[PDB]
Design a protein around this ligand. Structure first.
Ligand SMILES: NC(=O)c1ccc[n+]([C@@H]2O[C@H](COP(=O)([O-])OP(=O)(O)OC[C@H]3O[C@@H](n4cnc5c(N)ncnc54)[C@H](O)[C@@H]3O)[C@@H](O)[C@H]2O)c1
Ligand SMILES: NC(=O)c1ccc[n+]([C@@H]2O[C@H](COP(=O)([O-])OP(=O)(O)OC[C@H]3O[C@@H](n4cnc5c(N)ncnc54)[C@H](O)[C@@H]3O)[C@@H](O)[C@H]2O)c1
Ligand SMILES: NC(=O)c1ccc[n+]([C@@H]2O[C@H](COP(=O)([O-])OP(=O)(O)OC[C@H]3O[C@@H](n4cnc5c(N)ncnc54)[C@H](O)[C@@H]3O)[C@@H](O)[C@H]2O)c1
Ligand SMILES: NC(=O)c1ccc[n+]([C@@H]2O[C@H](COP(=O)([O-])OP(=O)(O)OC[C@H]3O[C@@H](n4cnc5c(N)ncnc54)[C@H](O)[C@@H]3O)[C@@H](O)[C@H]2O)c1
Ligand SMILES: CCCCCCc1ccc(Oc2ccc(Oc3cccc(O)n3)cc2)c(O)c1
Ligand SMILES: CCCCCCc1ccc(Oc2ccc(Oc3cccc(O)n3)cc2)c(O)c1
Ligand SMILES: CCCCCCc1ccc(Oc2ccc(Oc3cccc(O)n3)cc2)c(O)c1
Ligand SMILES: CCCCCCc1ccc(Oc2ccc(Oc3cccc(O)n3)cc2)c(O)c1
Ligand SMILES: [Cl-]
Ligand SMILES: [Cl-]
Ligand SMILES: [Cl-]
Ligand SMILES: [Cl-]
Ligand SMILES: [Cl-]
Ligand SMILES: [Cl-]
Ligand SMILES: [Cl-]
Ligand SMILES: [Cl-]
Ligand SMILES: [Cl-]
Ligand SMILES: [Cl-]
Ligand SMILES: [Cl-]
Ligand SMILES: [Cl-]
Ligand SMILES: [Cl-]
Ligand SMILES: [Cl-]
Ligand SMILES: [Cl-]
Ligand SMILES: [Cl-]
Ligand SMILES: [Cl-]
Ligand SMILES: [Cl-]
Ligand SMILES: [Cl-]
Ligand SMILES: [Cl-]
Ligand code: NA
Ligand code: NA
Ligand code: NA
Ligand code: NA
Lengths: 268, 268, 268, 268
């Protein structure tokens, strides 16, 4: 009856109840999956969030820049799900770009050290999670990451755009590796959803030129989307991720599914 | 329990048991849908095929070049499904290109009259089916057509490539109209499957230069696909169509989902 | 000293002094080319226009839907340029879509007969001009057509969008044929320029919903273009065409060069 | 008479006589430009190369990871070209990826520190060269970088593919900044040319599985290219760069011109 009945799925990237990952975890549980959750840094605060999910799920610590956490991750997961059991799904819902690389800060003023950190967390980590977790994934399994279409430049998103372009490229290579295990790798390119991350970008630009341009982006998304776009509601995005975690897109890999109201298909 | 439990879905394009449409219809029925089927020209022969589906379904006549059949289609469907009921899904699985526009015939030697017929049936008909059927579609509904990625030229496919490029463009406009009804429109770009149509192209090129090149295309698809590609098996394609007919890709429209083993994401 | 010194170039599509073709012809002549011009239907009126070019050039009649004109074209050109001489360049700057397929007329209300005419003139003719003219083209030669980026749907452009999508596909196949003669084939995707054609679309939508949307398209082009966009000035487009007619893009074929101020590379 | 008569152009990336930059510099000089050259690390060896250019040109030191070299670059250039003179063109022809990120080394085994270095030199440096040099560029000017189409994954190129995907994204943002100065920014996506860099990749894979796959890539390029592809000959690529440095692509920015024999437009 549930789309993900019987599946064991790791979900990274819960930080608040608004997190795309929170809604992915919620719909997944609603659809019969057994979750393992990972969180970064503020674990006590994240546990308060995860308590509001429909079911209990273990929360493991994962800083994707921490080599020890990556090296121990498989064993920690196996310990949570029981020896002899493997994962069927992995969700990377993780991003970061130091403030110099996003927002009102001029593009040319982001030092490489900041850019490099953002690319580590937002792009390279997709590879390093796959490297850690493919060895405990079942054939038929699915790795999904989150993307924002970086095909064209835009105001404010700046070096995160560059990180997403790298992420898309990384995904195409992770698919080559994943396929050796019978595993798909794909991204969901979402339209804008009011998360802590989105709020940070918007809020940090209020009152500035970039904020005027972000306003235009926000207005235009729903306008261009043939079926509309509601920026409050992560459910449609979460459902799409669940579709890729299911067995119903079995010939799709190294690819990008756009959960954006169809906006990217319309010039206006 | 079924992905399409309760849904009423029209499926065009069954000609043999190998038809992508046959497998779409089969998986849809397996997943709890109630079908209405359309067939072109050889209706007595098609009925012998549809008898082998898991359940009985009415077969209506539809030649997409026939204006009377298009004008009467909604009423004929409503009569099959019962007054007061509407469709939730529509599958366009239809193509044709006169032999001068595909295969070994030189590209420049296809007269426009032949090209125009192929584009009518393979591209424009996506619009005219949508125009006929949106008025009897429920909000939440889904229109899916079948595509073969025409982003790059290739041997033999010739003017059908041109028809598919037009089809992708048509789909983006059908989505604008469909969205007024709460309806999604999308294509599934499939990898090669041995259907009557594919056999016709391959067979018509055996022993010729183009056949050597088609051989390379066939070999290369499974090689490039990170998860492989089996040209016998339409099931993975049919499942993808069913995914788009479901409620699990609710923010995707005017778009293309690639059910091709990930081949299009890999240069080699 | 001139980019096209010594080259013989056919230029189709002059109808008014504002025609993209007029400016292509003008810059080409400025750059040392010897032109042969083709015109459709209103030849006496077109001659009044071509008299304003910097040099005299013969004007031949070509209706691309007329099979006799296509069959006689090579011989007529050879007669204009002298036996023993061939063309180095061909410019297709031709488009048409019956009024039912563009503007305020609903997308679904364009009958196929109208759509088919538009695709004949706007897309298939690129192939049929190449078929007629490659036999009198020198190795090193160049065929260029005019495109408007149809990657995404948009208001009003409607079935012309579909014709342009087909044109891009046709160009990729013309390149395969052209390469047998040492000849490149490419499109220039221009931003909007106030021509008779553009005026017709804009004017036919004044006072209607579509006209409000065209206004947004016009405003947005210059805004998104990092170097700006001036819709009066065809020169930048004409220069780009001349670049492809030159020897300075010798490894580019089956491709699209965007002369649009960079707009297509920017979401906003 | 020369395409670049009167223009002052900086050209980075000469390491051997086979360097794409060497041929860019050579054709540019042939076409009347005045060059300033930058080299990395092996300056005495590079000077032996640059002595073989058609004219003398000053060679400045630039390690793009060195912040002092970047901070002093404009002043050093101005000193070479004379106070009161500015650049009209800048060529970034620079790449590097530590050996763990390219070749036979498994994709997942490249540590981020190596990946980060490759992205610094191959992608971020496009921004930091633009940031250093736009302040001494004339309106009408042109910045060009070198790309290898990273739209699809492939054997061996691995993390350099990821760097190129980031580079394309960076270019789209550099165009927004450059446009404030009346300056275009674009990449040329070249087909494969036997340079020190290409030889390193090919040579490092000889005798291994990846080398078999590179062989297929090499064979397939000329096959798919409608006009062919000669991997010895950088001239066609160099000419394309010169086209973008000229005034003949005046409405193209944030974009990519493919100097690849048209291969990327053909599936096979
Ligand atoms: N919200 C949108 O509009 C939108 C649109 C498209 C794509 N996305 C993508 O969705 C994903 C989730 O973002 P969100 O909008 O839900 O925001 P969010 O702020 O809720 O989530 C971001 C997450 O990244 C995690 N993270 C940061 N550094 C980390 C590290 N070192 N190790 C592990 N995790 C780390 C944070 O802990 C947090 O859980 C991101 O990849 C984002 O780019 C968001
Ligand atoms: N088989 C593949 O490898 C492949 C790959 C990608 C996409 N596709 C697409 O899938 C769709 C189905 O093709 P298939 O491979 O199952 O072949 P098929 O030969 O089984 O189906 C083609 C169908 O088109 C129908 N058709 C033709 N003219 C018609 C008309 N005038 N009115 C109505 N229907 C008409 C035929 O009756 C037939 O049912 C097509 O759009 C095809 O281009 C096929
Ligand atoms: N103006 C723009 O903004 C713009 C933008 C992008 C692309 N384009 C393309 O540029 C090309 C030229 O259009 P334009 O804007 O200069 O308009 P225009 O109205 O000046 O030119 C259109 C031309 O098409 C010709 N034509 C129509 N039917 C013909 C037939 N049967 N045979 C031969 N020629 C025929 C007309 O005679 C006319 O010369 C077209 O392909 C158009 O789609 C224009
Ligand atoms: N050769 C091909 O087939 C091909 C194809 C497409 C694109 N390209 C691109 O062309 C460009 C030139 O490469 P090439 O093939 O001529 O190779 P090459 O080995 O001749 O040039 C590479 C250059 O990068 C320079 N470089 C490396 N680290 C540097 C640093 N820290 N600071 C400054 N310069 C540094 C080297 O000094 C060298 O001059 C690269 O961007 C490459 O990716 C090459
Ligand atoms: C700039 C246009 C506004 C619409 C942006 C849509 C969007 C919104 C949120 C997105 O998700 C993240 C996630 C993490 C992220 O990195 C962050 C988050 C907070 C602070 C910080 O320094 N980096 C940036 C964006 C995202 O990838 C895309
Ligand atoms: C030329 C490369 C071989 C792989 C082609 C993959 C493919 C195989 C079959 C496809 O489906 C159709 C359906 C109808 C069609 O039109 C036909 C079919 C039979 C005869 C005829 O004249 N036209 C052509 C292809 C399709 O769209 C794509
Ligand atoms: C709808 C958005 C407005 C911007 C459109 C930019 C554009 C403007 C003009 C273009 O050129 C043509 C050329 C012929 C053409 O067909 C015509 C022209 C006049 C009347 C008619 O029926 N068809 C349509 C557009 C073109 O291809 C694109
Ligand atoms: C893997 C398929 C073989 C065809 C690759 C075509 C290609 C050949 C050469 C290319 O240029 C570079 C330039 C620098 C570069 O970084 C290098 C060069 C030498 C050693 C090293 O560690 N990194 C890698 C490639 C390039 O970007 C693309
Ligand atoms: Cl904590
Ligand atoms: Cl833990
Ligand atoms: Cl640990
Ligand atoms: Cl909202
Ligand atoms: Cl939803
Ligand atoms: Cl019958
Ligand atoms: Cl019937
Ligand atoms: Cl009827
Ligand atoms: Cl097979
Ligand atoms: Cl399957
Ligand atoms: Cl007349
Ligand atoms: Cl005549
Ligand atoms: Cl005649
Ligand atoms: Cl204007
Ligand atoms: Cl100009
Ligand atoms: Cl030295
Ligand atoms: Cl120096
Ligand atoms: Cl210094
Ligand atoms: Cl060679
Ligand atoms: Cl050349
Ligand atoms: Na909308
Ligand atoms: Na494979
Ligand atoms: Na602008
Ligand atoms: Na070839």
């Amino acid at each position: 009856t549930g789309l993900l009945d019987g599946k064991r799925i790791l979900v990274s990237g819960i930080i608040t109840d608004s997190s795309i990952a929170f809604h992915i975890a919620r719909v997944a549980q609603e659809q019969g999956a057994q979750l393992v959750l990972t969180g970064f840094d503020r674990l006590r605060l994240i546990q308060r969030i995860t308590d509001r999910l429909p079911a209990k799920a273990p929360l493991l610590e994962l800083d994707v820049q921490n080599e020890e956490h990556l090296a121990s991750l498989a064993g920690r997961v196996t310990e949570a799900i029981g020896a002899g059991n493997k994962l069927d799904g992995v969700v990377h819902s993780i991003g970061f770009m130091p403030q110099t690389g996003m927002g009102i800060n001029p593009f040319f003023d982001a030092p490489y050290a900041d850019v490099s950190k953002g690319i580590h967390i937002s792009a390279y980590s997709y590879a390093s999670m796959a490297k850690a977790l493919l060895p405990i994934m079942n054939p038929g399994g699915s790795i999904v990451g989150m993307d924002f279409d970086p095909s064209r430049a835009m105001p404010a998103y700046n070096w995160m755009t560059v990180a997403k372009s790298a992420l898309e490229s990384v995904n195409r290579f992770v698919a080559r590796e994943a396929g050796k295990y019978g595993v798909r790798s794909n991204l969901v390119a979402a339209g804008p959803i009011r998360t802590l991350a989105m709020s940070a970008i918007v809020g940090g630009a209020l009152g500035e030129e970039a904020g005027a341009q972000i306003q235009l982006l926000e207005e235009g998304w729903d306008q261009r989307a043939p079926i509309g776009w509601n920026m409050k509601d992560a459910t449609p995005v979460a459902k799409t991720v669940c579709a890729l975690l299911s067995d119903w897109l079995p010939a799709t890999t190294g690819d990008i599914i756009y959960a954006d109201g169809g906006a990217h298909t319309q010039l206006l």
